[PDB]
Amino acid sequence: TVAYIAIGSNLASPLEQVNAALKALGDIPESHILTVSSFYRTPPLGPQDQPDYLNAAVALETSLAPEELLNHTQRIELQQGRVRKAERWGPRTLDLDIMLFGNEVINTERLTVPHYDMKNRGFMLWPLFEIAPELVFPDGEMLRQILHTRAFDKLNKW
Numbered sequence: 729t730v731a732y733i734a735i736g737s738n739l740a741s742p743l744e745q746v747n748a749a750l751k752a753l754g755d756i757p758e759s760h761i762l763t764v765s766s767f768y769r770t771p772p773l774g775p776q777d778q779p780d781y782l783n784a785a786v787a788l789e790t791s792l793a794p795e796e797l798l799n800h801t802q803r804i805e806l807q808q809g810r811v812r813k814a815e816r817w818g819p820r821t822l823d824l825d826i827m828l829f830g831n832e833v834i835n836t837e838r839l840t841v842p843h844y845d846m847k848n849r850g851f852m853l854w855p856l857f858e859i860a861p862e863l864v865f866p867d868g869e870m871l872r873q874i875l876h877t878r879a880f881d882k883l884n885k886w
């Protein structure tokens with residue numbers, strides 16, 4: 729099954745964190761990376777006195793179950809999601825989200841697939857669109873259609 733994973737990091741200098749995350753995604757068992765989007769630079773949500781985010785999309789081929797895949801992405805967030813600040817480990821700055829999982833719809837305590845708010849977020853839609861422009865959601869909506877309708881600006885690359 730082809731799973732699409734969103735990556736976000738709002739570290740001040742996130743390239744190594746994001747690359748460590750990508751390698752970690754590549755090491756998940758029963759799975760392999762098919763494609764990775766460009767890296768984009770996006771302003772954060774809420775107030776603008778915060779660091780920008782690096783966002784990207786990853787296509788992962790996997791024979792894991794959705795919630796097993798979620799165990800792995802949450803494990804990576806726990807192991808790699810904090811950078812060591814001088815006196816301590818800093819706040820988590822890495823987000824890994826399952827946007828789509830094959831054509832499946834999932835509504836569990838732990839997992840909402842398609843991602844619960846991706847259609848509001850160009851920083852999720854545009855990286856996905858770069859690696860799956862023809863994508864159709866389980867319910868028949870089309871990724872192209874959502875971007876056309878909302879007209880979210882194209883993102884700047886990192």
Ligand SMILES: Nc1ncnc2c1ncn2[C@@H]1O[C@H](COP(=O)(O)O)[C@@H](O)[C@H]1O
Pocket residue numbers: 823824825826827837838839840841842843844
């Ligand atoms: N598609 C998804 N991808 C990643 N986390 C998800 C998803 N759907 C629901 N979640 C839940 O979202 C929470 C986000 O955790 P956190 O990143 O610490 O804010 C987790 O507790 C997950 O169980």
Ligand SMILES: Nc1nc2ncc(COP(=O)(O)OP(=O)(O)O)nc2c(=O)[nH]1
Pocket residue numbers: 735736737770771772773780781783823845851
């Ligand atoms: N530009 C950009 N802005 C963002 N703002 C908020 C969240 C995180 O959203 P969510 O998990 O839904 O909730 P919370 O921010 O409270 O963790 N992620 C990004 C991101 O990836 N890129």
